């Protein structure tokens, strides 16, 4: 009985979204000058991890980066000089995600264990120690992100996202809209809203304070592994196993553009935009990262400096360089 | 050149690298194992006999040692029962252990499908699978009982015989041997369907109370590691 109304609403959603399809991103932006060939070189080669690199994040200083490997350790790297700042052993050896707090005081990571523990980088004791453990999830932690030094948002495979308060270590609000494991999460520039992709081949817009789904974007045909917010906050790109990257807009409620190529028949692991947003840097299972023009939707360049699968990729806040982590236990910074 | 504090930073980085080097030796020496199976597969029985923490724990770690050789056996805890995503985490494990209840003829097909999906996974191509046909006592009692027949679920069982390679235990009834080798071979057909020599199957027969599982796993892991070394050397 209720399902009858659901079909009516679903038809209504398509009709309104379709009505706004005034012109594709390709037609409107066809006249812009081509981005051209973008060539990047490995400026710094970071090695030392024992197992595959799974996740990495850049700090607000554009110099320090955190890299996560399934050997059970987090290493803080001085990107400018390759010096190692800290070595944090991990109780759980299968960490799948990591984060770097904007203040540079805390680092969080999680994995197959249902805890995304927070590690304090700056303590008078002189060594990194665990300050809190967040054990509210019933699935593997896939992505944990900070909104403030007291609040961290986490995603896990139990199809539910949670918002935590570090001081009390409890879930202030719970997100349960997805029907599949959540793989990716990224915060807006103002931290007011965040988008996460799951295996249901759909991406949903979430409000931190309201705790409700503002918008949904199916888009893909298979699982979505990565998601990144556009610098202006009005768009976001997604990476999925369907071997195509899709760009979505929170204002138009439609897929702006699809980045794909015939030679690519493998899924995407990570996606990230440059500082200005004109370039989309994404990871692929074929051991190389392809650079896509956000507007022209053409292959600007290819990075093939990794011998194994690339799982993480991120751009500095200043857009000065992009780091690539791969299962070969090496991280390379490109500029 | 380098400033005074830059030299100290480089010294700290070198010390951290040295710390990492020591950790690497343990990592290679330590052997990681993945434990998989249904609820009736009796994974807990193997997990028990550990002669050598959180309610919502997503993964469990089991530590046991044989002949000064450290084995880490991992069992997944609280999860949504979907594996195609987090299974990517176990692409470099030494081996995968799959336990099955030979006794449940109804759930044998489910176990076979689970093994086939794991075997054909694109991320587990280079990882061999160790198969333990647990709870053979129930299988022996059930066959010997005659109340239930495997023919009802596996029609090919009506025209199957124990191969000459069989090595049944003394005093076992021929029906028990036929059923046991029928199961193992049903599993091998999936094992041999697409092995291609990159990974192999190690079937074993286990009971709810058996202390030889540790040595069986030791032998299987040693063989797997030796085969991997031979492949790396190019002699395989």
């Amino acid at each position: 009985q209720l399902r009858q109304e659901a079909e009516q609403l679903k038809n209504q959603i398509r009709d309104a979204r379709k009505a706004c399809a005034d012109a594709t991103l390709s037609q409107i932006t066809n006249n812009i000058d081509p981005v051209g060939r973008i060539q990047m070189r490995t400026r710094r080669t970071l090695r030392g991890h024992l197992a595959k690199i799974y996740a990495m994040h850049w700090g607000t200083d554009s110099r320090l980066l955190v890299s996560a490997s399934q050997d059970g350790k987090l290493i803080i790297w001085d990107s400018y000089t390759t010096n190692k700042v800290h070595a944090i052993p991990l109780r759980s050896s299968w960490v799948m995600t990591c984060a770097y707090a904007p203040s540079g005081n805390y680092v969080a990571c999680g994995g197959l264990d249902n805890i995304c523990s927070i590690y304090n980088l700056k303590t008078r004791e002189g060594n990194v120690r665990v300050s809190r453990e967040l054990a509210g999830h019933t699935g593997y932690l896939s992505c944990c992100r900070f909104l403030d030094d007291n609040q961290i948002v986490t995603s896990s495979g139990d199809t539910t996202c949670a918002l935590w308060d570090i001081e009390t270590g409890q879930q202030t609000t719970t997100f349960t809209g997805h029907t599949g494991d959540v793989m990716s999460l990224s915060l807006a520039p103002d931290t007011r809203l965040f988008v996460s992709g799951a295996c249901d081949a759909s991406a949903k817009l979430w409000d931190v304070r309201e705790g409700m789904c503002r918008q949904t974007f199916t888009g893909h045909e298979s699982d979505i592994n990565a998601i990144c917010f556009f610098p202006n906050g009005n768009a976001f790109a997604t990476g999925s196993d369907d071997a195509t990257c899709r760009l979505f807009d929170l204002r138009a409620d439609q897929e702006l553009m699809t980045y794909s190529h015939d030679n690519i028949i493998c899924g995407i692991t990570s996606v990230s935009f440059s500082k200005s947003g004109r370039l989309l840097l994404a990871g692929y299972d074929d051991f190389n990262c392809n650079v896509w023009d956000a507007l022209k939707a053409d292959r600007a360049g290819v990075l093939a400096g990794h011998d194994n699968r690339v799982s993480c990729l991120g751009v500095t806040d200043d857009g000065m360089a992009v780091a690539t982590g791969s299962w070969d236990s090496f991280l390379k910074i490109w500029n | 050149t380098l400033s005074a504090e830059d030299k100290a930073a480089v010294e700290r980085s070198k010390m951290i690298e040295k710390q990492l080097q020591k950790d690497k030796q343990v990592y290679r020496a330590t052997h990681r194992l993945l434990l998989l199976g249904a609820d009736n597969s009796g994974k807990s029985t193997i997990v028990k006999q550990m002669r050598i923490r959180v309610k919502t724990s997503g993964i469990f770690e089991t530590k046991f040692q044989v002949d000064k050789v450290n084995f880490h056996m991992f069992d997944v805890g609280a999860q949504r029962d979907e594996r195609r995503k987090w299974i990517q985490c176990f692409n470099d494990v030494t081996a995968i252990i799959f336990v099955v209840d030979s006794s449940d003829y109804n759930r044998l097909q489910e176990a076979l499908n689970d093994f086939k999906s794991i075997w054909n996974n694109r991320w587990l191509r280079t990882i061999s699978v160790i198969l333990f046909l647990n709870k053979q006592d129930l299988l022996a009692e059930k066959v010997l009982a005659g109340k239930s027949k495997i023919e009802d679920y596996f029609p090919e069982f009506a025209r199957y015989t124990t191969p000459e390679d069989a090595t049944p235990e003394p005093g076992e009834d021929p029906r028990v041997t036929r059923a046991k080798y029928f199961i193992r071979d049903e599993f091998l057909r999936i094992s041999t369907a697409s092995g291609d020599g990159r990974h192999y199957c190690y079937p074993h027969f286990t009971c709810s109370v058996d202390t030889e599982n540790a040595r069986r796993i030791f032998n299987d892991v040693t063989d797997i590691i030796i085969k991997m070394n031979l492949r790396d050397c190019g002699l395989f």
Partner: single-chain antibody
Amino acid sequence: VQLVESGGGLVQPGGSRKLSCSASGFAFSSFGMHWVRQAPEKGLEWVAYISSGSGTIYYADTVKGRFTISRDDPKNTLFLQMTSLRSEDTAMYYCVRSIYYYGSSPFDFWGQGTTLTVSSADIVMTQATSSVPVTPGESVSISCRSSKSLLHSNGNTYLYWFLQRPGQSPQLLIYRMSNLASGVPDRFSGSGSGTAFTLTISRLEAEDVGVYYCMQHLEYPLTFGAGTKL
């Protein structure tokens, strides 16, 4: 964080005595230790340094050879063995920890010290103002000069400010000439041009009374200024 050092006493000229410095409450193995001594009526003076891994060791020329530095990381103890003690060696010795990494704060904690009684390429720090009369509520600027610019090519101006309250060990105020150490009031701030430096004490308080010492960390042979007493 706590550092307790012992071994002080009276030694006749030409004698030998051994100092000790035990640490607790923090990872002693991860912090490099420095020896700084103050004469009864003089400022600070660097003595020796031992790295976290005991690899790099440096000594002051005035005590070169005579002083040797050893530590026992398992015992969380830092030693100073001295031989052929001369008259000039009489001073109160403080062991100071240091950890060096990007964004670090070396010389963040100082021990109470131990009194010892005995029966030219280094950068010279100039502090003309021996003392300045100050009153609560006012702002006073302390300026010092260095013979060589401390601004290294990496972009860091290696300057350190230390405040030594009467009856208490020196406490770091500012490091790298811009950053404020944790636990210090925000009203403390400093600046410099690379060779001329200034430390500003806004909203002076009765607790601010003491001697301000400046140090340069560009080169291992550390040198300290004359010191300004407010």
